[PDB]
Amino acid sequence: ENVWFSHPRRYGKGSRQCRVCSSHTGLIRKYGLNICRQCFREKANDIGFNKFR
Amino acid sequence: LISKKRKLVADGVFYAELNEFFTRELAEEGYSGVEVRVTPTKTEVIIRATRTQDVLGENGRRINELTLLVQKRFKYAPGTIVLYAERVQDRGLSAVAQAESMKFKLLNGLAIRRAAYGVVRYVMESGAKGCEVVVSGKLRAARAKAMKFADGFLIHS
Amino acid sequence: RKKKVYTTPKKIKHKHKKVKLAVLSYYKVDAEGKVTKLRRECSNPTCGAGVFLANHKDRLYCGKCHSVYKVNA
Amino acid sequence: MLMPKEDRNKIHQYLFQEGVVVAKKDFNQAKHEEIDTKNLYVIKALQSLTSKGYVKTQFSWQYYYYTLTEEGVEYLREYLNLPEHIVPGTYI
Amino acid sequence: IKIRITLTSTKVKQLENVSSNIVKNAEQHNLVKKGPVRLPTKVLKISTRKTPNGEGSKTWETYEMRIHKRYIDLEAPVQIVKRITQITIEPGVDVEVVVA
RNA sequence: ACGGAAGGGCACCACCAGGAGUGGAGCCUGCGGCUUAAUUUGACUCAACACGGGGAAACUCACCAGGUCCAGACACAAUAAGGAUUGACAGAUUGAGAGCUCUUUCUUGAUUUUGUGGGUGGUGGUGCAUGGCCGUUCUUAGUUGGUGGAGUGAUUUGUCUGCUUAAUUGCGAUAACGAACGAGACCUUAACCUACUAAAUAGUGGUGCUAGCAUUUGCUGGUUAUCCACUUCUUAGAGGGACUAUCGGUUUCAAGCCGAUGGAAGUUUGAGGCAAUAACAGGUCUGUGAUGCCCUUAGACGUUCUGGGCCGCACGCGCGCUACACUGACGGAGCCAGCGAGUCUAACCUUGGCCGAGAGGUCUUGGUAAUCUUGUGAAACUCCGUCGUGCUGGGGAUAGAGCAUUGUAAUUAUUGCUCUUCAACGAGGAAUUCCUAGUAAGCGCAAGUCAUCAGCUUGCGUUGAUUACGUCCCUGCCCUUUGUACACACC
Ligand SMILES: [Mg+2]
Ligand SMILES: [Mg+2]
Ligand SMILES: [Mg+2]
Ligand SMILES: [Mg+2]
Ligand SMILES: [Mg+2]
Ligand SMILES: [Mg+2]
Ligand SMILES: [Mg+2]
Ligand SMILES: [Mg+2]
Ligand SMILES: [Mg+2]
Ligand SMILES: [Mg+2]
Ligand SMILES: [Mg+2]
Ligand SMILES: [Mg+2]
Ligand SMILES: [Mg+2]
Ligand SMILES: [Mg+2]
Ligand SMILES: [Mg+2]
Ligand SMILES: [Mg+2]
Ligand SMILES: [Mg+2]
Ligand SMILES: [Mg+2]
Ligand SMILES: [Mg+2]
Ligand SMILES: [Mg+2]
Ligand SMILES: [Mg+2]
Ligand SMILES: [Mg+2]
Ligand SMILES: [Mg+2]
Ligand SMILES: [Mg+2]
Ligand SMILES: [Mg+2]
Ligand SMILES: [Mg+2]
Ligand SMILES: [Mg+2]
Ligand SMILES: [Mg+2]
Ligand SMILES: [Zn+2]
Ligand SMILES: [Zn+2]
């Protein structure tokens, strides 16, 4: 039908989702990476992020 | 035409997605990590694994299909992406190879202690200074509790 | 989850199965042996005289130009 | 799932030509890259293929990497009515 | 002819190796140049709760990515320019050359 | 383990001497309770309550009243191209150009539909079945093998009387010797380099052209293709530098401690990151395409559309913002930072010009960013003035009316602006929190979330005090000795 996915998702938490976990809450939208923070804490040392202080 | 910041974080994300894809697909070939080198004329992806013959396949069939999959997903042009495979230096000194070895052993049905002690023996015989293997979960019991196998000396700080 | 009552009218009512009549697509035929035509067809060059329009009542409804033809004889 | 024969044949011939296929896990996308077919039809055709042993799958960050086997390539060969040793995605 | 070459990596010693081999190539070919301009490194900070859930003591975590950027300006014929871009590349180092 | 037992030593999540306060008032926000169709839910001492990065219009969303769709793969059987099945103009119906369903017939043609089996999906349950992560016990200094020794043994010694240390840090003593982990070392960061490398994407000086005042040299400025030179400031890269150096005291005269001089720096230089063994039946299946079992699985707890709700209010708590005024409010001038973010197949940070009281609008411009926004000309602050101890020009809640922006949509006002309204509050009771130097406190600024919305957090810098430099009185931590009818261990 023409009402299956009609509601707009041009913005809001429904427009974004994790590129790993398909989650809407907990996003890091910084630097255009768009990862939930849990998955970010997993994949950070791979991405090139590291703790120094 | 992208900021250098976003360029580099996208490089990191590309590496991470490749790593998870390869550790999901090539678990049974001994996938022990990967490297990426950008270049004019192409970018190349150097897998480091153990069963290079199985990663290659017959006439490089698997390399071909994996190259094409990467090209299709990350929207590279055909030929701008290259894959090489390499017999990894120091199999024993790979945290992930031994981990997947434990996984396959326990899944085929080997025992916890036999598997872990075989692994730590192989590591320490492979020229390592220390090792430590932990197995948490449900062990012969509904209640969960950890086992910790060790040899040599490790540091934590 | 406590329990479901469906206070709505219990009207599980899903539609027809494209109701299966006998053979159809009758144009008409003569005795010895000419053919004749029912189901006045479209006016569109996109419909190459292969589709029938409909005639529900007060309107003729199309099938290839699936809705764009409406003026009633 | 139900879908038009021409769409399924687009899927199957693209798959025979390329050897593999990718489909972002975005239902209601309505337009797959490299195939004008609906993304849902891509996914579900490949699903019906998987369950009968032909093609295999990985999800991998919501992307559904699909890749076919020898049973798959011979089945697609006799399906698309193509000659023996026509071409797989296995050229050097 | 006035090219600029920028090097926008994270690995400082790989970057400095590239800068060094480039400049010694420049001086063995006897090319005047503005030396390696080391721009200020920029630190992509990301601050997050360590925990997935909400409870616990509110402990925070600042991950950092250090981006080190350098550039060199050269005056040279395009033949030596193209072979220069043909040489002097490293893993984990992003380079770009620009004319004028 | 515990002790209202001892001995020694530690801590501003403890006290002392004090500072700012909170609790008192209005408001914000979270929790409970109450109410409700639903007001989704987890968490309840420290170790829940501005936490879930949770600042919810719709989505988020899981809840409520309702309505669609099937994304039920695959195998078998059934029906079945004289048709399996799909879709549909208009009307009724419906919130609804949802055929959802019905009327009426048109359309399509093997993909389907029905049944069986079997899966799939689930922010459904179980965090007491689990993983992983996190927090805490525990920010303290503690932990454990090997070989010997003691003991029938559980176990012990080593791992210590003393002295010292932030420190099982060390001097040393010694039935233990030799080791490992932890601490330390280390890594990052901030402070020094007129020593090196350089740099119109950072500067400085000079010389060209040029504005103004003085003119007598000069002073302040402008200047992109005027070039020349330099790197003190600024950036980084490679290095150096401090190791308690030197001196005097004091200690078996050892580890070390105090003072003074020098020095950028002499509280392990300052702040952090990583951070042991053993555990909690701590939290989380609502982050996971991490997950076992149970439940449900086509009028589904799947998925999605509309509209509500999570904000709901007789009350009780917590984190906070505003202030209760002259060390002040207001109007003018003055006028100074730092950390950082930013547009691609997009539409971001926006300068400048114009309009408008204002918010804001519009025409252009720069920037993928040491280059442009941005000297982010921030705020408190300083100088001039108005007011003048009056719940007063303090305070600015609660209301009314209008104008703009975001967004499909703001109605239980999203926010912003204008005018008017002008409530408590007159320094906060029992109680209680944080803090020892560029620290508290005041002050605002960037980012995070983000279409819009900061009163929150994460960091940044501007101004910058007082009072200890000590003790174990309270609350607790460590070590030892001691006692114990405790062992899920003084609840
Ligand atoms: Mg003290
Ligand atoms: Mg006191
Ligand atoms: Mg206050
Ligand atoms: Mg505590
Ligand atoms: Mg809804
Ligand atoms: Mg909602
Ligand atoms: Mg638990
Ligand atoms: Mg757990
Ligand atoms: Mg013994
Ligand atoms: Mg004995
Ligand atoms: Mg012993
Ligand atoms: Mg000049
Ligand atoms: Mg001395
Ligand atoms: Mg330190
Ligand atoms: Mg979990
Ligand atoms: Mg649901
Ligand atoms: Mg709430
Ligand atoms: Mg709090
Ligand atoms: Mg003023
Ligand atoms: Mg600045
Ligand atoms: Mg006032
Ligand atoms: Mg903001
Ligand atoms: Mg809101
Ligand atoms: Mg918040
Ligand atoms: Mg207290
Ligand atoms: Mg007694
Ligand atoms: Mg007992
Ligand atoms: Mg008692
Ligand atoms: Zn994720
Ligand atoms: Zn027609």
Cα–Cα dist E23/E81, whole Å: 13
A11-50 burial code (b ≥16 CB/10 A, e <16): eeeeeebbbbeebeebbbeebebbbbbbbbbbbbeebbbe
- Listed in sequence order, the residues at least 6 apart from D41 whose beta carbon sits closer than 8 Å to its beta carbon are D1, D3, D7, D8, D11
Structure tokens belonging to residue E81: 């320019």
**Topology adopted by domain E1-90:** Alpha-Beta Plaits (3.30.70)
For residues E60 and E46, is the Cβ–Cβ distance under 8 A? no
**Cβ of E24 less than 7 A from strand F:** no
Q: Where are the beta strands (DSSP E) in chain E?
A: 3-9, 33-38, 42-49, 60-74, 95-99
Q: Would you call B9 an interface residue with chain A, using a CB distance cutoff of 8 Å?
A: yes
Phi, psi of D10 (to 5 degrees): -60, -50
DSSP B109-123: T--HHHHHHHHHHHH
- Round to whole Å and give the CA distance between A35 and A25: 10
Helix (H, G, I), strand (E, B) or coil at E97: strand
> B125-134, long-range: CB within 8 Å, 24+ apart, which pairs?
B125/B92, B126/B90, B126/B91, B126/B92, B126/B93, B127/B90, B127/B92, B127/B93, B128/B92, B128/B93, B128/B152, B129/B153, B130/B154, B133/B98, B133/B102
Q: How far apart are CA D1 and CA A42, in angstroms?
A: 37
- Provide the experimental method for this PDB entry: cryo-EM
Reduced to 3 states, what is the DSSP secondary structure of residue B151? strand
CB proximity E77–strand F (7 Å threshold): no
Is the separation of the CB atoms in E99 and E60 below 8 Å? no
- CB of E99 lies under 7 Å from some atom of strand F: no
Give Cβ neighbours of residue B70 (< 8 Å, ≥ 6 apart).
Answer: B18, B45, B76, B81, B83
Which of E90, E91, E74 is CA-nearest to residue E82?
A: E74
Q: Which domains does chain A have, with CATH numbers?
A: 1-53 (4.10.830.10)
The domain locations on chain E are 1-90
Q: Are B80 and B45 in contact (CB under 8 A)?
A: no
Q: Give me the resolution in angstroms, 1 decimal.
A: 2.8
Report yes or no: D31 at the A interface, CB cutoff 8 Å.
no
List A residues 11-40 in contact with E (Cβ-Cβ < 8 A). 28, 30-31, 37-38, 40
Q: B12–A31: do the CB atoms touch at under 8 Å?
A: no
| Beta carbons within 8 Å of A24's beta carbon, 6+ residues apart | A13, A14, A16, A17, A18
Alpha-carbon span B21 to B27, nearest angstrom: 10
| Cα–Cα dist B31/B86, whole Å | 10
Among candidate residues D54, D55, D74, D76, the one with its CA nearest the CA of residue D65: D55
Alpha-carbon distance of B30 to B24, in angstroms, equals 11
If we measure between CA atoms, which residue out of D25, D33, D18, D15 comes closest to residue D60? D25
Q: Is A13 on the interface with D (CB under 8 A)?
A: no
Q: Which residue of A has its CA nearest to B21?
A: A20
User: DSSP of B5-70, one letter per residue?
Assistant: HHHHHHHHHHHHHHHHHHHHHSGGGTEEEEEEEEETTEEEEEEEES-HHHHH-GGGHHHHHHHHHH
What are C13's two structure tokens? 């009512």
Residues 19-48 of chain C: which lie with beta carbon within 7 Å of strand F? 19-23, 25, 39
Q: Which domains does chain B have, with CATH numbers?
A: 12-86 (3.30.300.20), 95-157 (3.30.1140.32)
- What gap in Å lies between CA B120 and CA B22, rounded to an integer? 25
Alpha-carbon dihedral D41, D43, D46, D48, rounded to 10 degrees: -80
